[PDB]
Design a protein around this ligand. Sequence first.
Ligand SMILES: [Ca+2]
Ligand SMILES: [Ca+2]
Lengths: 49, 39, 39
Amino acid sequence: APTIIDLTCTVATCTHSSDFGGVLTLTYKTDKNGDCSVHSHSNVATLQE
Amino acid sequence: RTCRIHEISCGAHSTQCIPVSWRCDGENDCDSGEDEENC
Amino acid sequence: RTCRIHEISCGAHSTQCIPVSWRCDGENDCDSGEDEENC
Ligand SMILES: [Ca+2]
Ligand SMILES: [Ca+2]
């Protein structure tokens, strides 16, 4: 699996509506192209992917 | 060329390996967008 | 090319000296897989 280092999170927009009204972006340094699984560890926010 | 068995190459001048599963999945992943040629 | 006798060169445009033991050892020891060609 790819190795992710220096992960940083910045929120572009945020609207607390019924649908997915927020967008966030992650910047990182990796070593190879691959797939990673994303998760939110609080139920305040629900990822779409 | 001659990358890991899991990953295929998508260039001649450049070195940029991609997983096989990315090949022909309806979205580009290489500058020379040959992941989506000859599906 | 023109590396140490104990080793070979496995590139023309690019220089990369590898020991002779890495020549046809069943693994691609160079960026271009010309170690495992015409064994
Ligand atoms: Ca693709
Ligand atoms: Ca070899």
